Amino acid sequence: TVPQCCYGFCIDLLIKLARTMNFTYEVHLVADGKFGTQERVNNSNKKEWN
Amino acid sequence: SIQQQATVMLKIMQDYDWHVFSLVTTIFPGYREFISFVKTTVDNSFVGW
Ligand SMILES: *[C@@H]1O[C@H](CO)[C@@H](O)[C@H](O)[C@H]1NC(C)=O
Ligand SMILES: *[C@@H]1O[C@H](CO)[C@@H](O)[C@H](O)[C@H]1NC(C)=O
């Protein structure tokens, strides 16, 4: 979990929102690496978001 | 237990090609948690009744 440097359109929008709302953002990256949805991994019927 | 009975009923409905059902109950102690359990089971199931 080394800290990288991320930027782009989304972070610019986040900075604008923080400036307009006094937000102290803490940027994080998805460990799973996917958008995530309801998937069955175990425990039979499990529509849990990932 | 009644939850096992509800799961068996859901499996029987699935096997019987019955993907649409209506839950009609009556006011009686203990049935509220059974209704909650069956609702959670049908929501989490991928069958999509
Ligand atoms: C959020 O909106 C409410 C009402 O629209 C406003 O009173 C409040 O100041 C807003 N928050 C910020 C941080 O401006
Ligand atoms: C932004 O809002 C915070 C409230 O969490 C407040 O303490 C701070 O003074 C505000 N900043 C400005 C520049 O008004």
Do residues B26 and B34 make contact, with C-beta atoms less than 8 angstroms apart? Answer: no
Resolution of the PDB structure in angstroms: 4.3
Work out the burial of residue B6: count CB atoms within 10 Å of its CB; fewer than 13 is exposed, 13-18 middle, 19 or more buried. middle
What is the Cα–Cα distance from B40 to A48, expressed in whole angstroms? 12
Q: How many Cβ atoms are within 10 Å of A17's Cβ, its own excluded? A: 11
Q: Which residue has the tokens 């990932």?
A: A50
Do residues B30 and B2 make contact, with C-beta atoms less than 8 angstroms apart? Answer: yes
Range list of H helices, A1-50: 9-21
Range list of H helices, B1-49: 2-15, 31-44
Task: Determine the residue among B7, B44, B45 to mutate to test chain A binding: the one whose Cβ has the most chain A Cβ atoms within 10 Å.
Answer: B44
Do residues A17 and A23 make contact, with C-beta atoms less than 8 angstroms apart? Answer: yes
Q: How many Cβ atoms are within 10 Å of B10's Cβ, its own excluded? A: 19
Two tokens, residue A15: 């900075």
Experimental method: cryo-EM
Contact A47 B43 (CB under 8 A): yes
